[PDB]
Design an enzyme around this catalytic site. Structure first.
Site, PDB file in Angstrom:
ATOM      1  N   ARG A   1     -36.362  11.162  13.577  1.00  0.00           N
ATOM      2  CA  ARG A   1     -35.780  11.470  12.275  1.00  0.00           C
ATOM      3  C   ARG A   1     -34.550  12.350  12.458  1.00  0.00           C
ATOM      4  NH1 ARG A   1     -40.399  14.149  10.540  1.00  0.00           N
ATOM      5  NH2 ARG A   1     -40.617  16.376  11.067  1.00  0.00           N
TER       6      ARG A   1
ATOM      7  N   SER B   1     -41.405   9.187   6.412  1.00  0.00           N
ATOM      8  CA  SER B   1     -42.637   9.614   5.755  1.00  0.00           C
ATOM      9  C   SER B   1     -42.324  10.406   4.489  1.00  0.00           C
ATOM     10  CB  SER B   1     -43.539  10.409   6.691  1.00  0.00           C
ATOM     11  OG  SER B   1     -44.835  10.570   6.135  1.00  0.00           O
ATOM     12  N   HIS B   2     -42.654  11.699   4.490  1.00  0.00           N
ATOM     13  CA  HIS B   2     -42.538  12.564   3.318  1.00  0.00           C
ATOM     14  C   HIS B   2     -41.201  13.287   3.244  1.00  0.00           C
ATOM     15  CE1 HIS B   2     -44.427  14.616   6.724  1.00  0.00           C
ATOM     16  NE2 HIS B   2     -43.797  15.709   6.330  1.00  0.00           N
TER      17      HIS B   2
ATOM     18  N   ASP C   1     -47.559   9.173  -0.098  1.00  0.00           N
ATOM     19  CA  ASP C   1     -46.283   9.578   0.464  1.00  0.00           C
ATOM     20  C   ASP C   1     -45.331   8.382   0.608  1.00  0.00           C
ATOM     21  OD1 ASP C   1     -47.510   8.393   2.666  1.00  0.00           O
ATOM     22  OD2 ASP C   1     -46.663   9.792   4.119  1.00  0.00           O
TER      23      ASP C   1
ATOM     24  N   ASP D   1     -44.084   6.473   2.886  1.00  0.00           N
ATOM     25  CA  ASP D   1     -44.404   5.292   3.673  1.00  0.00           C
ATOM     26  C   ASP D   1     -45.868   4.881   3.567  1.00  0.00           C
ATOM     27  OD1 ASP D   1     -45.142   7.623   5.176  1.00  0.00           O
ATOM     28  OD2 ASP D   1     -45.120   6.457   7.018  1.00  0.00           O
TER      29      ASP D   1
ATOM     30  N   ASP E   1     -49.007   6.423   4.241  1.00  0.00           N
ATOM     31  CA  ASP E   1     -50.171   6.688   5.070  1.00  0.00           C
ATOM     32  C   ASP E   1     -50.858   7.994   4.698  1.00  0.00           C
ATOM     33  OD1 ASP E   1     -48.742   7.837   8.260  1.00  0.00           O
ATOM     34  OD2 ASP E   1     -48.219   8.413   6.199  1.00  0.00           O
ATOM     35  N   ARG E   2     -50.377   8.677   3.654  1.00  0.00           N
ATOM     36  CA  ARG E   2     -50.995   9.878   3.110  1.00  0.00           C
ATOM     37  C   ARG E   2     -51.373   9.694   1.647  1.00  0.00           C
ATOM     38  NH1 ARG E   2     -47.687  14.742   5.727  1.00  0.00           N
ATOM     39  NH2 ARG E   2     -48.098  15.599   3.621  1.00  0.00           N
TER      40      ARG E   2
ATOM     41  N   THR F   1     -54.459  18.058  16.402  1.00  0.00           N
ATOM     42  CA  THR F   1     -53.582  17.359  15.476  1.00  0.00           C
ATOM     43  C   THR F   1     -52.905  16.194  16.188  1.00  0.00           C
ATOM     44  OG1 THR F   1     -51.672  18.803  15.946  1.00  0.00           O
ATOM     45  CG2 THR F   1     -53.161  19.487  14.172  1.00  0.00           C
TER      46      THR F   1
ATOM     47  N   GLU G   1     -57.575  14.252   8.125  1.00  0.00           N
ATOM     48  CA  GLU G   1     -56.748  15.422   8.444  1.00  0.00           C
ATOM     49  C   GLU G   1     -56.522  16.241   7.182  1.00  0.00           C
ATOM     50  OE1 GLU G   1     -53.499  13.369  10.026  1.00  0.00           O
ATOM     51  OE2 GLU G   1     -54.208  13.456  12.126  1.00  0.00           O
TER      52      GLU G   1
ATOM     53  N   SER H   1     -54.002  17.578   6.137  1.00  0.00           N
ATOM     54  CA  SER H   1     -52.708  17.228   5.539  1.00  0.00           C
ATOM     55  C   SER H   1     -52.690  15.880   4.785  1.00  0.00           C
ATOM     56  CB  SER H   1     -51.653  17.308   6.621  1.00  0.00           C
ATOM     57  OG  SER H   1     -52.149  16.608   7.732  1.00  0.00           O
TER      58      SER H   1
ATOM     59  N   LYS I   1     -53.004   5.663   9.638  1.00  0.00           N
ATOM     60  CA  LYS I   1     -53.706   6.109   8.443  1.00  0.00           C
ATOM     61  C   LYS I   1     -53.221   5.286   7.249  1.00  0.00           C
ATOM     62  CE  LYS I   1     -51.916  10.082   9.191  1.00  0.00           C
ATOM     63  NZ  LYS I   1     -51.129  10.189  10.472  1.00  0.00           N
TER      64      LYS I   1
END
Ligand SMILES: [Co+2]
Length: 564
Positions: free
Chosen positions: A25, A119-120, A290, A292, A294-295, A359, A378, A380, A391
């Site tokens: 990133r 991601s986020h 999120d 993408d 996965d959260r 983690t 997790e 998070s 995830k």
């Protein structure tokens, strides 16, 4: 066109293209203003594929919709074609959720995939951009492969590209490219963004039961907030069109190149819109994803917050509400070390192995690949299963609906029953952001020295009501049972005899500014304790943590930056 020339571009390597565990990133301006930065990196990825295996290889390509994605996909195609990659499978408009890429790689036995997501992190002309590489089991590239890509990126001297090749990302089907003087064609298959992933969930869950739950009289009323990210179309096509939830269930479900100007990061403040919707009391269940996918954050009636550590525990405790696990069985549970011990109470009651990992995904994937791991979580906002090797945010939502459909109780009532059955692990995470690096390091080192003294185990800590007694204190180490790796220094743990814990980590990426992450896990079983406010019940351990670490003294912080 459509017959294209292959060209070699002399290039100059950059030295900072580390692929990491979650991708490369950088600010979007960097990809845009640094000549051949993306081309170089895409070339470095493809050079890890043995030339002789490229024609029969397929790469899956897609991303979360953020600004610059489509330009990167064109760039991946131009470089994949020129290097002899036989086929790309690309989601329509470039859109593929991260769990969807994992699904597709494994389904078609692709050699891997390139996911365009950060991601986020914020997106847009002034936002961040990311490039993620997945390998043939559908999961993140392990350290050995990311090491090779990095090594190549630092010394690359030329790359191959078909400059005139352009893929129409908008129309479904197979586009074929004839390369000048190359004998075999280059093939791009544009696939519907949702279908393969939806077909997977259709196998995994009982969509009939869910259709009855979400449709009709006395329906469960839900609000699903994709935070203007990649999961929007999944929500509309799966939860609304197929399963019959009213169209209003899909909140911020049009992917936006800037995620609407907000962080597509699910929590109570970044997803304030969803929480306020839920506060009216009209809907039974809410969730946010999120960027993408996965959260996930799970909310109940009136905005009741299911913290992620409790969520995997409720799924674990009701896991056979989900047809997939009825067939495979539960091979094991796992959580990262700082996630709360809620899952452990269930893994002990159901007599299932509980794996406590540092983690990071790699540890779950290893356990999943060994058929020793069915469900992982997790702290998070992460929940997953071994259905793929990422995830899966929407998967967790459909899991909750299965349990709500089977339990026929409210979200809040399910959580109270769980706490009544297993006790409650009150849990919070304190983030201290951009702290001076020197002080934090002394804080961790001194605390580790304190804990390492022979007399520290057995030390007693008074609370203002209870006494916490130190049962164990160390700097977390993990010997990976699959690949044999030893992960050391993973977090200072203060384990108390009553089931409570304090855990300190100094955050990795501490280059723009260090981060202290303090996790507090206070276990209570008494009914007169299980329904009070968490931050009240957590106050004694917070006091003990700050006193023993002297966090205030080493940093000048009187409060964390963020509390989750
Ligand atoms: Co993510």
């Amino acid at each position: 066109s459509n017959m294209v020339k292959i060209v070699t571009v002399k290039t100059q390597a950059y030295q900072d293209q580390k692929p990491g565990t979650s991708g490369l990133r950088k600010r979007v301006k960097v990809f845009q203003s640094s000549a051949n930065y993306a081309e170089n990196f895409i070339q470095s990825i493809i050079s890890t594929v043995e030339p002789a295996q490229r024609q029969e290889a397929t790469l899956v390509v897609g991303g979360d919709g953020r600004f610059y994605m489509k330009e990167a996909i064109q760039l991946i195609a131009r470089i994949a074609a020129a290097n002899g990659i036989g086929r790309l499978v690309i989601g329509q408009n470039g859109i593929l959720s991260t769990p969807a890429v994992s699904c597709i790689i494994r389904k078609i036995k692709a050699i891997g995939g390139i996911i365009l997501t950060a991601s986020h992190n914020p997106g847009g002309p002034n936002g961040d951009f990311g490039i993620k590489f997945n390998i043939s089991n559908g999961g993140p590239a392990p350290e050995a492969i990311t090491d090779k890509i990095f090594q190549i990126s630092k010394t690359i001297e030329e790359y191959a590209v078909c400059p005139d090749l352009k893929v129409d990302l908008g129309v479904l089907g197979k586009q074929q490219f004839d390369l000048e003087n190359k004998f075999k064609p280059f093939t791009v298959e544009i696939v519907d963004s949702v279908e393969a992933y939806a077909t997977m969930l259709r196998s995994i869950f009982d969509f009939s039961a869910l259709k009855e739950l979400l449709s009709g009289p006395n329906r469960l009323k839900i609000r699903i907030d994709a935070m203007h990210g990649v999961v929007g179309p999944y929500v509309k096509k799966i939860l609304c069109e197929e399963l019959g939830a009213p169209a209003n269930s899909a909140v911020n479900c049009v992917p936006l190149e800037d995620f609407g100007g907000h962080h597509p990061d699910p929590n109570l403040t970044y997803a304030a819109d969803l929480v306020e919707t839920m506060k009216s009391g009209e809907h039974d269940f809410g969730a946010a994803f999120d960027g993408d996918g996965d959260r996930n954050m799970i909310l109940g009636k009136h905005g009741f917050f299911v913290n992620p550590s409790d969520s995997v525990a409720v799924i674990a405790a009701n896991i056979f509400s989900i047809p997939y696990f009825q067939q495979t069985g539960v091979r094991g549970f796992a959580r990262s070390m700082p996630t709360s011990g809620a899952l452990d109470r269930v893994a002990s009651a159901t007599k299932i192995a509980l794996y406590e990992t540092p983690t990071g995904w790699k540890f779950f994937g290893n356990l999943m690949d060994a058929s020793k791991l069915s469900l992982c979580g997790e702290e998070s906002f992460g929940t997953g299963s071994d259905h793929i090797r990422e995830k899966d945010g929407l998967w967790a939502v459909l899991a909750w609906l299965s349990i709500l459909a089977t339990r026929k109780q409210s979200v809040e009532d399910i959580l109270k029953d769980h706490w009544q059955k297993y006790g409650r692990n009150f849990f919070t995470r304190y983030d201290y952001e951009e702290v001076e690096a020197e002080g934090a390091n002394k804080m961790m080192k001194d605390l580790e020295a304190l804990m390492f003294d022979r007399s520290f185990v057995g030390k007693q800590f008074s609370a203002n009501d209870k006494v916490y007694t130190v049962e164990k204190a160390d700097n977390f180490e993990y010997s990976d049972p699959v690949d044999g790796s030893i992960s050391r220094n993973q977090g200072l743990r203060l384990i108390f005899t009553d089931g409570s814990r304090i855990v300190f980590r100094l955050s990795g990426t501490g280059s723009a500014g260090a981060t202290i992450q303090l996790y507090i896990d206070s276990y209570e079983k008494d009914v007169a304790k299980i329904n009070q406010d968490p931050q009240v019940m957590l106050a004694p351990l917070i006091s003990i943590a700050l006193k023993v670490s002297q966090l205030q003294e080493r940093t000048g912080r009187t409060a964390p930056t963020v509390i989750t």
